[PDB]
Design a protein around this ligand. Structure first.
Ligand SMILES: CCCCC/C=C/C/C=C/C/C=C/C/C=C/CCCC(=O)O[C@@H](COC(=O)CCCCCCCCCCCCCCCCC)COP(=O)(O)O[C@@H]1[C@H](O)[C@H](O)[C@@H](O)[C@H](O)[C@@H]1O
Ligand SMILES: CCCCCCCC/C=C\CCCCCCCC(=O)OC[C@H](COP(=O)(O)OCCN)OC(=O)CCCCCCC/C=C\CCCCCCCC
Ligand SMILES: CC(C)CCC[C@@H](C)[C@@H]1CC[C@H]2[C@@H]3CC=C4C[C@@H](O)CC[C@]4(C)[C@H]3CC[C@@]21C
Ligand SMILES: CC(C)CCC[C@@H](C)[C@@H]1CC[C@H]2[C@H]3CC=C4C[C@@H](O)CC[C@]4(C)[C@H]3CC[C@@]21C
Ligand SMILES: CC(C)CCC[C@@H](C)[C@H]1CC[C@H]2[C@@H]3CC=C4C[C@@H](O)CC[C@]4(C)[C@H]3CC[C@]12C
Ligand SMILES: CC(C)CCC[C@@H](C)[C@H]1CC[C@H]2[C@@H]3CC=C4C[C@@H](O)CC[C@]4(C)[C@H]3CC[C@]12C
Ligand SMILES: CC(C)CCC[C@@H](C)[C@H]1CC[C@H]2[C@@H]3CC=C4C[C@@H](O)CC[C@]4(C)[C@H]3CC[C@]12C
Ligand SMILES: CC(C)CCC[C@@H](C)[C@H]1CC[C@H]2[C@@H]3CC=C4C[C@@H](O)CC[C@]4(C)[C@H]3CC[C@]12C
Ligand SMILES: CC(C)CCC[C@@H](C)[C@H]1CC[C@H]2[C@@H]3CC=C4C[C@@H](O)CC[C@]4(C)[C@H]3CC[C@]12C
Ligand SMILES: CC(C)CCC[C@@H](C)[C@H]1CC[C@H]2[C@@H]3CC=C4C[C@@H](O)CC[C@]4(C)[C@H]3CC[C@]12C
Ligand SMILES: CC(C)CCC[C@@H](C)[C@H]1CC[C@H]2[C@@H]3CC=C4C[C@@H](O)CC[C@]4(C)[C@H]3CC[C@]12C
Ligand SMILES: CC(C)CCC[C@@H](C)[C@H]1CC[C@H]2[C@@H]3CC=C4C[C@@H](O)CC[C@]4(C)[C@H]3CC[C@]12C
Ligand SMILES: CC(C)CCC[C@@H](C)[C@H]1CC[C@H]2[C@@H]3CC=C4C[C@@H](O)CC[C@]4(C)[C@H]3CC[C@]12C
Ligand SMILES: CC(C)CCC[C@@H](C)[C@H]1CC[C@H]2[C@@H]3CC=C4C[C@@H](O)CC[C@]4(C)[C@H]3CC[C@]12C
Ligand SMILES: CC(C)CCC[C@@H](C)[C@H]1CC[C@H]2[C@@H]3CC=C4C[C@@H](O)CC[C@]4(C)[C@H]3CC[C@]12C
Ligand SMILES: CC(C)CCC[C@@H](C)[C@H]1CC[C@H]2[C@@H]3CC=C4C[C@@H](O)CC[C@]4(C)[C@H]3CC[C@]12C
Ligand SMILES: CC(C)CCC[C@@H](C)[C@H]1CC[C@H]2[C@@H]3CC=C4C[C@@H](O)CC[C@]4(C)[C@H]3CC[C@]12C
Ligand SMILES: CC(C)CCC[C@@H](C)[C@H]1CC[C@H]2[C@@H]3CC=C4C[C@@H](O)CC[C@]4(C)[C@H]3CC[C@]12C
Ligand SMILES: CC(C)CCC[C@@H](C)[C@H]1CC[C@H]2[C@@H]3CC=C4C[C@@H](O)CC[C@]4(C)[C@H]3CC[C@]12C
Ligand SMILES: CC(C)CCC[C@@H](C)[C@H]1CC[C@H]2[C@H]3CC=C4C[C@@H](O)CC[C@]4(C)[C@H]3CC[C@]12C
Lengths: 346, 296, 400, 284
């Protein structure tokens, strides 16, 4: 039996070594050393254009609208506000019976919002143009987990919402009936973020967990097709490259990395000596040329995706930066904070 | 004749009549504090300690009533008995009371409450009124022998040639009871340099600290003017300088301390004494030189 | 250990500050009034950081410095608001015993002992701060019965500290006010000790066959060369440079730069612009993304009498956008109309594709015709869509 | 024609011969106390509070050695400067040292003794001495404004037959200065009736309360004699009185404050465990 065990060990070693030698032969050039042909960029003068106030505590998450003007944000004390960014007018409000409302998303049709937090439930609020509206009567519970809700987002339609919680499971629900459709397992620790694939035809999504892994799932069946592990600590946020063939992640070791799907390996690392505070949210420009990152040292950094050199640093916040999203048209990005404020940059 | 300086009768009666009102609205307010006697503010600073400021200010309105009636002896002596005896009983008890609001807070880390209202703030006022009272007896007894020989204590001054008037002389003992009233208030400035932090309920330790900062500034001017621009001056201009000082210094004080109080709101304790030094000994060696990089 | 990663990288910098050969010198200063021992100027650090860390921007160096100070590593000698200022102010390090990485979380029975110690020292003045005295009154209200023992310990610490040196009694007493200032901050300053609530919480042969099937999956997966992968990224990025508002301004102007709302109206209009039409031909996916593109593409096919394939294509996602309550009836309607035999809109499928959907129609679901979805998708991308580009209607709209 | 009485030898320089010896032995006592500085006797009182009584006592010796010479307008001002700047420092830290040994005893019925020390007693001798300079500065100016007038601060007086004497006059500010010396020691008498039973190691409250009490009967007769019996006087009966009042007053005082220092002699139980718990980690 020991001879057979040794033979199996030798076969496993041979298969492994075959894998590394295939990776070595496929690895020939580097992204920066091949994109050096690309001309360098000039100077950027991005400045604050609006400043949204009214929250009574820390601001935890936000999401843009499909009309490129409206914004929905969430706070610690359970208050959800739907703003009008271009003119700075509050349009709706609701106080949710929990604290630490972590996740909020905005429906593509602009008729519903989603929210959740420590109550381990995700709720969907219809939107109407009534006077003295009471959305608490229309509030509908959809998802139920055994741990806090971390991040949720509607799919390409208005009937299904994804869910990520601290129990290490991601689930797909139906908003109208509350019936679960598919459950995803494979994280041994908490799940902190997720993002749908940019391609509407592509039925996949990515999720990053506390176990230092980014995990790509299949919506039809439920088992992952890829797995990455190169971070030194928690993975705080992930996002797809607009081409749909790559995704970047921002982890707590103060680095943002850009993985690849065809190459099955990372192709860049964005880090600097003067930066020692961990990232918290990333997003891409419209063309994928810039990777915005909102750090915990109160600042915002912008990186050249192709080259790897920083282009600008934007001060202004007086506490941590909790979130960062780029508007659908690609003209401006907003960034919440723990200083009770949101600022729209452009 | 026309050898005398002329005087007014309307611009002069409008001073002895406007001050006969501030001397009646200072005696009426002494029967308002007694009739009430029970409030969250009037019980803090006791009546025995507050009503001696509304009676000590009643002696600070006299130096102008005498300065109108006529000049003579007994009206030039009475003008100094009622400025030093009305200064040591007003700003001498807004300084022993700004001294109590420091030594009742350090006594809340224990249980003694040493300074009683009329026990340690009014028994320390009988010592201030004993140095100011021994001096006045000595001064009025040495200018009574000198009036026999040559000095009449009332002189004359001349302005615009043929215009004469009678004034009250300023002797060399008046330059010294203006430095004694300025050094003494420097104690009331330090005493409010150490109470800027003590938590107070009605902020009284702060409305009495601007009545002291007022006088160290606004009364060092009235004395300098009265000592330089004195020989020439006038008879109706001196009456205004006094009236412009006994309404801008003492009236602002009985208003800074009266209306804000009506409107604006065995072996067991032995061994523990040793072990508690062991904790501060073991804890001390961790920071003392253990890789502190400052001490070495 | 939530913050331990960043606490282990500010400490590495501190050790580099303290080095004797190439670090910050410590000096004793006297200016005609008194002797101040073992301090360094505020402008010493800011000039140090720009050199060793290569922080070109001077605001960035001052922002990095003030975060180290605010966390409890070096502090102003005579202030209660920890910060870093680029002037001659004197700062001093913190002893490694009080470092925040030592897992400190003091109670309120230990703050009062420190707070009562200050009143005993210099009992003619009561030197404190406005907020400190307010806390002292509050703590005595709560800790009433045991106040004796808090005051009793304050006496012992005072007399023990009295028997010390003079240079040491000042340094070791400032580095106990830069510890309670970090842990009990002055009102109006962010409390850096707060933390997020998410982060405050057999035979050996069977293993081999799991590993064997684990390795073959990676071998099964197809990979490309980094030369080809890099080309795809750069080609895609360079193809949309003219479309990025951040790196090439819009027409007429950015609504967030010049308050010109017309930009959104033009894009949302029913008449596509010249820039819009050019983006149409980049790929068939881009055309289908635009709702106007869907109509124009369908309009050409119905004139060509070959739109039966598009009608099947759009029908599948409409089922997927439909709530589950109506899927069993929706799947049969698509079944009969398009791919059932004798259908008015009959279409052709591959045998393998038809077999899977034939056995799956019995169990309705949102993903029933996914294989047919891919089969139709591929043929449009090769033949039908390129024909639309060659169609005269495409170039006529291109030039206007 | 006898008008000025001449006399010397037997009385005149005999007084200043011995009066120059007391001031000579007073300085060596300021170099003997400092050299020892460590015996338990003088460690109890304090060195600073014992060197201001052996220094302020020199000033009380001057009023005999400036009365020896002929009167002047400058030697009649130093006579009132070295009598109040000396009485306010000798019997100003004896009444205060006898106040510290009363308010510490009152802290034996209570607890938490702070033991105010030679810093507290010397912060209260700078306020008693601040009032004295304010008066003395304000008094010489007063007798400097009438120097341009009569009352020349230097007088003349005659006797029965024909003999006139060039003496120094008595002001009405001297009747009030001799009363401030009598109402100030009435406070020190009360400070020895409330310490009458308080124990002490060296019995200093006793050899010192015989000083603030002796210099209240004998220094109240000298002043009354100097005032009432002042018209006639002589230029030799002046020295016989100042000599006979200084050595019975300021020599007896620095004898009693110097010789005796050399010649003779519940949940506590619960709280203990929490202290022990932190002491159990500390001891390991
Ligand atoms: C020959 C004749 C010689 C005899 C002379 C007798 C006296 C002259 C003054 C008698 C009173 C002094 C004895 C007690 C002093 C004391 O007692 O010394 C306290 C001081 O006070 C202060 O500063 C006040 C400062 C005021 C400034 C000086 C005025 C300027 C010039 C005045 C000219 C004269 C005016 C004449 C009229 C015109 C130490 O300062 P303190 O802060 O008051 O000490 C506190 C403790 O801290 C508490 O614990 C305790 O409870 C309190 O009783 C105690 O007062
Ligand atoms: C000669 C030159 C000047 C002579 C001045 C005239 C003196 C005439 C008689 C003086 C007799 C003095 C009586 C004894 C004094 C006395 O009783 O002190 C008791 C003492 C003890 O009480 P405790 O509460 O136990 O405090 C303990 C700390 N000491 O009480 C005090 O502390 C009182 C101290 C506060 C009063 C401030 C001292 C006086 C300052 C100044 C002079 C007066 C006024 C200033 C200006 C006034 C108007 C221009
Ligand atoms: C009134 C003038 C002429 C003489 C002043 C002497 C007396 C009568 C004055 C008037 C008011 C008196 C005080 C009134 C009240 C008290 C409280 C008592 O528990 C002790 C005595 C004490 C502190 C008195 C001390 C002496 C005092 C200050
Ligand atoms: C003319 C003479 C007698 C008086 C001159 C001394 C003046 C300036 C006064 C009188 C009382 C004095 C002392 C009392 C108060 C203090 C505060 C204490 O914390 C240190 C000593 C200090 C500072 C002393 C020095 C100077 C002082 C403030
Ligand atoms: C200038 C100096 C010497 C004069 C001193 C007189 C002062 C101390 C005297 C005279 C009038 C007295 C007041 C007369 C009226 C009252 C109201 C009574 O219910 C309690 C006593 C009280 C509050 C007295 C307090 C002391 C007082 C103010
Ligand atoms: C106004 C307040 C302070 C009342 C205090 C009483 C004082 C001012 C009064 C009471 C009795 C008065 C004395 C009465 C009579 C004379 C004789 C006169 O030829 C000179 C003044 C002299 C010696 C007065 C001086 C002032 C005096 C002492
Ligand atoms: C104001 C001046 C001129 C008047 C002089 C009298 C004053 C200084 C004297 C006379 C009698 C003295 C009182 C006699 C007895 C006591 C009892 C006790 O409680 C101690 C102080 C106290 C209350 C004394 C305080 C001071 C006192 C009131
Ligand atoms: C106890 C304190 C406050 C007051 C001191 C007592 C006063 C009232 C006494 C003590 C000394 C006295 C003076 C001593 C001698 C004379 C000379 C005589 O030809 C006229 C009266 C006169 C001028 C006396 C007036 C009253 C007097 C000033
Ligand atoms: C009302 C009393 C008890 C208290 C105030 C004392 C003052 C006002 C009094 C008390 C004794 C008085 C003195 C008594 C005797 C004389 C001698 C006389 O030839 C001139 C006035 C003179 C010098 C008096 C001046 C005023 C005086 C000092
Ligand atoms: C410079 C000389 C001539 C006089 C100047 C007066 C000023 C500077 C002095 C004289 C008396 C002094 C006070 C005497 C006693 C004390 C008590 C001490 O614990 C704190 C300071 C304090 C309160 C002193 C502050 C300063 C002071 C008011
Ligand atoms: C701190 C303040 C209150 C101190 C007050 C003292 C001031 C005002 C005193 C001190 C010296 C004084 C001067 C001394 C001498 C003379 C000559 C005489 O013809 C009067 C004016 C004049 C020129 C005095 C004016 C007032 C004066 C300047
Ligand atoms: C006759 C004129 C010139 C003098 C009168 C001044 C007095 C009566 C007035 C004038 C300015 C007034 C003060 C103005 C400001 C404040 C601060 C606020 O808390 C209201 C009360 C208070 C504290 C007032 C109290 C009364 C005051 C001191
Ligand atoms: C205003 C005048 C009269 C006050 C008397 C002078 C004082 C300030 C001086 C004179 C000599 C001085 C002393 C000289 C030497 C020493 C010995 C030293 O080990 C302690 C201080 C001490 C004891 C000094 C204390 C202050 C002192 C007593
Ligand atoms: C020595 C003489 C000639 C110089 C002038 C006298 C004045 C300036 C001196 C003499 C005695 C001195 C005091 C002696 C002792 C102390 C106690 C301590 O707290 C320091 C200040 C203080 C309170 C001194 C202040 C200044 C002082 C009052
Ligand atoms: C600080 C305390 C002890 C008070 C002492 C004040 C001294 C330093 C000051 C205050 C007022 C001053 C006097 C004011 C006016 C005059 C009149 C002038 O013709 C001669 C100088 C003389 C006499 C000044 C001498 C110095 C003086 C007496
Ligand atoms: C240094 C202190 C302790 C004592 C000295 C007191 C000083 C400040 C004062 C007291 C008496 C004052 C003198 C009194 C009067 C005159 C006459 C005048 O025509 C010129 C100034 C002159 C000569 C003064 C100069 C300053 C003076 C000497
Ligand atoms: C000038 C001469 C005649 C006066 C001297 C008087 C002598 C003989 C007497 C008068 C009163 C006496 C004192 C009265 C009270 C006390 C307090 C007691 O606990 C000890 C003795 C002591 C200190 C006495 C000592 C001797 C004493 C001072
Ligand atoms: C024991 C203390 C109070 C001593 C103070 C004594 C003073 C206040 C008093 C007591 C007796 C008084 C004397 C009694 C009689 C005479 C004789 C006369 O021809 C001139 C005044 C004169 C000389 C008086 C002057 C002042 C005097 C000396
Ligand atoms: C010139 C004359 C009148 C004065 C000189 C007398 C002085 C120096 C002498 C004479 C008698 C002496 C006292 C006699 C007896 C004792 C008792 C002993 O237990 C301590 C010393 C003490 C207290 C002596 C102190 C010094 C003393 C008072
Ligand atoms: C001559 C100049 C200074 C202005 C004339 C008015 C003076 C006498 C008055 C007007 C306003 C007053 C106050 C202004 C502000 C404050 C409030 C508090 O912090 C302490 C008193 C203090 C500092 C006062 C100082 C004296 C003051 C400046």
């Amino acid at each position: 039996e020991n001879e057979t065990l040794a033979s199996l060990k030798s076969e496993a070693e041979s298969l492994k070594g075959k894998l590394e030698e295939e990776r070595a032969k496929l690895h020939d050039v580097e992204l920066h050393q091949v994109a050096e042909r690309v001309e360098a960029l000039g100077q950027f003068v991005m400045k604050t254009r609006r400043t949204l106030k009214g929250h009574g505590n820390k601001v935890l998450c936000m999401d843009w609208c499909k009309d490129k003007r409206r914004i929905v944000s969430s706070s610690q004390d359970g208050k959800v506000i739907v703003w009008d960014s271009f003119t700075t007018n509050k349009e709706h409000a609701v106080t949710m019976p929990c604290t630490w409302v972590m996740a909020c998303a905005y429906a593509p049709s602009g008729c519903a919002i989603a929210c959740g937090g420590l109550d381990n439930k995700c709720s969907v609020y219809p939107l109407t143009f009534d006077k003295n509206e009471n959305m608490a009567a229309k509030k509908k519970s959809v998802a139920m987990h055994t741990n806090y809700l971390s991040a949720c987002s509607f799919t390409n339609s208005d009937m299904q919402i994804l869910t990520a919680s601290g129990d290490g499971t991601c689930a797909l629900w139906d908003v109208e009936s509350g019936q679960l459709l598919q459950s995803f397992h494979g994280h041994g620790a908490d799940v902190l973020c997720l993002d749908l694939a940019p391609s509407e035809t592509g039925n996949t999504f990515v999720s990053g967990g506390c176990d230092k892994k980014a995990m790509v799932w299949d919506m039809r069946s439920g088992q992952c097709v890829q797995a990455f592990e190169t971070h030194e600590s928690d993975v705080n946020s992930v996002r797809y490259y607009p081409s749909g063939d790559a995704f970047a992640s921002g982890s707590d070791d103060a680095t943002c990395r850009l993985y690849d799907l065809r190459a099955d390996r990372e192709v860049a690392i964005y880090s600097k000596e003067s930066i020692i505070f961990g990232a918290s949210s990333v997003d891409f420009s419209l063309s994928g040329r810039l990777l915005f990152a909102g750090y915990n040292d109160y600042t915002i950094n912008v990186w050249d995706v192709l080259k790897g050199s920083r282009v600008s640093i934007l001060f202004g916040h007086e506490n941590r930066v909790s979130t960062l999203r780029v508007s659908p048209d690609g003209t401006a990005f907003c960034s919440g904070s723990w200083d009770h404020t949101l600022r729209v940059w452009a | 004749s026309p050898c005398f300086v002329q005087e007014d009768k309307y611009l002069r009666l409008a001073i002895i009549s406007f001050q006969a009102l501030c001397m009646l609205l200072d005696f009426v307010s002494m029967l308002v504090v007694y009739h009430f006697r029970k409030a969250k503010s009037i019980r803090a600073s006791g009546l025995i300690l507050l009503e001696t400021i509304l009676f000590g200010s009643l002696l600070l309105y006299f130096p102008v009533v005498i300065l109108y009636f006529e000049p003579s002896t007994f009206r030039c002596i009475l003008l100094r008995w009622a400025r030093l005896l009305g200064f040591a009983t007003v700003y001498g008890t807004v300084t022993l009371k700004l001294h109590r609001v420091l030594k009742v807070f350090l006594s809340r880390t224990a249980q003694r409450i040493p300074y009683m209202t009329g026990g340690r703030v009014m028994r320390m006022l009988a010592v201030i009124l004993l140095v100011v009272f021994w001096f006045l007896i000595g001064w009025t007894s040495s200018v009574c022998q000198n009036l026999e020989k040559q000095i009449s204590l009332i002189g004359q001054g001349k302005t615009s040639d043929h215009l004469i008037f009678n004034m009250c002389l300023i002797d060399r003992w008046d330059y010294m009871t203006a430095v004694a009233e300025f050094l003494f208030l420097l104690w009331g400035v330090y005493l409010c340099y150490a109470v800027r932090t003590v938590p107070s309920a009605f902020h009284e330790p702060r409305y009495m600290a601007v009545a002291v900062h007022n006088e160290l500034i606004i009364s060092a001017i009235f004395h300098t003017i009265r000592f330089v621009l004195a020989s020439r001056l006038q008879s109706d201009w001196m009456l205004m300088l006094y009236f412009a000082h006994t309404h801008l210094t003492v009236t602002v004080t009985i208003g800074l301390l009266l209306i804000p109080k009506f409107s604006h709101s065995s072996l067991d304790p032995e061994d523990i004494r040793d072990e508690l030094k062991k904790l501060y000994a073991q804890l001390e060696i961790y920071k003392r030189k253990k890789m502190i990089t400052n001490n070495p | 250990s939530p913050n331990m990663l960043v606490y282990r990288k500010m400490e590495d910098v501190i050790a580099r500050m303290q080095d004797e050969k190439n670090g910050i010198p410590i000096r004793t200063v006297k200016s005609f009034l008194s002797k101040i021992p073992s301090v360094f100027s505020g402008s010493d650090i800011v000039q140090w950081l720009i050199k060793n860390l290569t922080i070109e921007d001077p605001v960035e160096a001052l922002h990095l410095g003030t975060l180290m100070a605010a966390h409890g590593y070096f502090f102003p000698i005579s202030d209660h608001v920890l910060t870093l200022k680029d002037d001659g102010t004197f700062y001093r390090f913190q002893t490694p015993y009080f470092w925040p990485s030592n897992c400190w979380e003091p109670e309120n029975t230990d703050y009062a002992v420190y707070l009562c110690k200050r009143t005993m020292q210099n009992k003619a003045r009561l030197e404190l701060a406005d907020y400190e005295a307010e806390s002292l009154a509050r703590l005595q209200r709560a800790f009433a019965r045991k106040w004796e023992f808090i005051f009793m310990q304050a006496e012992a610490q005072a007399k023990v500290d009295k028997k010390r040196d003079k240079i040491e009694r000042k340094i070791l007493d400032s580095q106990e006010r830069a510890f309670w200032d970090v842990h009990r901050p002055v009102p109006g300053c962010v409390n850096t000790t707060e933390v997020d609530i998410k982060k405050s919480s057999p035979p050996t042969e069977d293993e081999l066959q799991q590993q064997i099937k684990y390795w073959q999956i990676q071998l099964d997966r197809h990979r490309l060369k980094m030369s080809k992968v890099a080309d795809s990224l750069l080609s895609y990025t360079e193809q949309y440079l003219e479309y990025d508002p951040f790196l090439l301004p819009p027409d007429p102007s950015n609504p967030w730069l010049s308050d010109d709302t017309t930009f959104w109206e033009l894009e949302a209009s029913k008449e596509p612009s010249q820039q819009r039409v050019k983006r149409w031909g980049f790929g068939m996916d881009e055309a289908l993304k635009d709702p106007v593109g869907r109509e124009q593409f369908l309009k050409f096919l119905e004139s060509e009498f070959s739109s039966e394939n598009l009608r099947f294509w759009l029908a599948v996602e409409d089922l997927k956008k439909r709530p589950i309550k109506e899927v069993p009836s929706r799947v049969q309607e698509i079944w009969q109309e398009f791919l059932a035999p004798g259908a008015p809109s009959a279409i052709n499928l591959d045998s393998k594709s038809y077999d899977k959907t034939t056995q799956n129609v019995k169990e309705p679901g949102r993903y029933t015709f996914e294989d047919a979805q891919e089969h139709i998708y591929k043929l449009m991308k090769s033949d039908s869509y390129p024909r639309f580009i060659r169609s005269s209607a495409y170039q006529e709209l291109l030039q206007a």
